[PDB]
């Protein structure tokens, strides 16, 4: 039990570290008027698809 | 500029219109017909789904009739065969109802008489209905579609 | 009479399947090779 929930702290921690990377780095793009998102960071990351 | 937008034709109705720009026949694909002209009529048109555009080879012989392109789109004044367009900020914007369901092929124009886009549809909005409509890009054929914009 | 229980599928890296192993591997290979080409063109199209 100790070990699994260990994991599971480890799992979501990790996931949410991603997440929130996905966060810092696609919002800059998001209150922009123009909806570039480079399509570099449209694949590396999944992209909002910003609608023209 | 009226011997080069051919009209598609649906059981004995223009339902919409096929334009010839570019050494290319392109037409909106999503519109159902066929070319009034037939010795255009019987060529091969590859369809694409995702661009809503089906184009095809111009014959030899009538490519004079054919338009000229641009691709390079400054922020300003466009015509169109529905009075005029404005061109700003990535879209495209005419007065509401201007755009009639059904005409869904004709091309834009520049100031200087050349293709700059072509219409597919509209996504109807206060005083100035955008326009979503298929450019080409220096090589790349897009799609500029507002939200909610209707097949026309 | 025979003084073997008649059980006869070679078992892994017998020459016989090893053989189906490298076709299916190679073939499988190529499969996914042209999964990834796939998802990697159609990725940059839903982007560009």
């Known amino acids: ?52 | 500029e009226n011997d080069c937008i051919f009209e598609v034709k649906h059981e004995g109705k223009v339902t919409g219109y096929a334009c010839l720009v570019g050494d290319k026949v392109m037409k909106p694909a999503h519109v159902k017909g066929v070319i009034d002209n037939a010795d255009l009529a019987k060529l091969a048109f590859k369809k694409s789904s995702k661009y809503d555009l089906e184009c095809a080879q111009i014959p030899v012989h009538m490519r004079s009739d054919a338009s000229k392109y641009t691709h390079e789109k400054p922020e300003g004044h466009y015509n169109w065969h529905h009075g005029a367009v404005q061109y700003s900020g990535g879209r495209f914007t005419i007065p509401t109802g201007a755009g009639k369901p059904g005409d869904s092929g004709r091309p834009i124009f520049d100031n200087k008489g050349r293709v700059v886009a072509i219409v597919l549809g509209g996504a109807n909005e206060g005083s100035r209905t955008a326009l979503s409509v298929v450019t080409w890009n220096k090589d790349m054929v897009t799609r500029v579609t507002p939200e909610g914009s209707e097949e026309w | 009479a025979a003084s073997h229980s008649n059980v006869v599928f070679p078992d892994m890296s017998g020459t016989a399947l090893s053989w189906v192993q490298k076709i299916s591997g190679g073939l499988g290979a190529f499969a996914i090779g042209a999964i990834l080409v796939l998802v990697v063109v159609t990725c940059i199209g839903l982007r560009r």
């Open chain 1, 1 to 52: 039990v100790g070990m699994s929930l260990l994991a599971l702290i480890s799992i979501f921690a990790s996931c949410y570290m991603l997440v929130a990377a996905r966060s810092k780095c696609l919002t800059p793009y998001a209150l922009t008027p123009g909806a570039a998102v480079p399509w570099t960071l449209g694949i590396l990351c999944c992209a909002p698809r910003a609608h023209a």
